[PDB]
Structure 1
């Protein structure tokens, strides 16, 4: 998931199961003040929902990764 930040410009979050692409796109934009290009999702084998969230070319995925904590 470190690899997808630099190459992809992609944040990887864990999400609630009841969430969908629209809610993940809305909630990332609300908290961190970032424009989302697209969201993909998959349910993990352990049963949580992983969410790959690519941002636009303007807003850097690297900078938000410092601000959040995990880096």
Structure 2
């Protein structure tokens, strides 16, 4: 996930299993003030949902991840 943060401008989150892509995009806009280029989702083999959120070129995923606090 951190390789994708570095090398694809993409942020990786665990999300609620009931959420769709529209809600995830709205949530990241409301929580972190970023524009998602797209949201790709995935249900992991442990039953939890993973979202691949690529930001637009107007944002830097590494800087957002630093501000969030996990890098």
TM-score, normalised on structure 1?
0.97
Partner residue in 1 for 2:23: 23
- The 5-angstrom pairing of residues 4-23 of structure 1 reads 4-23=4-23
Partner residue in 1 for 2:38: 38
Cα displacement (A) at 1:6: 1.4
Q: Which runs of 5+ in 1 are unaligned?
A: none
Root-mean-square deviation over aligned CA pairs:
0.5
Partner residue in 2 for 1:58: 58
4+ aligned runs moved over 2 Å, structure 1: none
Cα displacement (A) at 1:27: 0.1
| Aligned residue pair count | 71
Give 3-state SS (helix, strand or coil) of 1:42's partner: strand
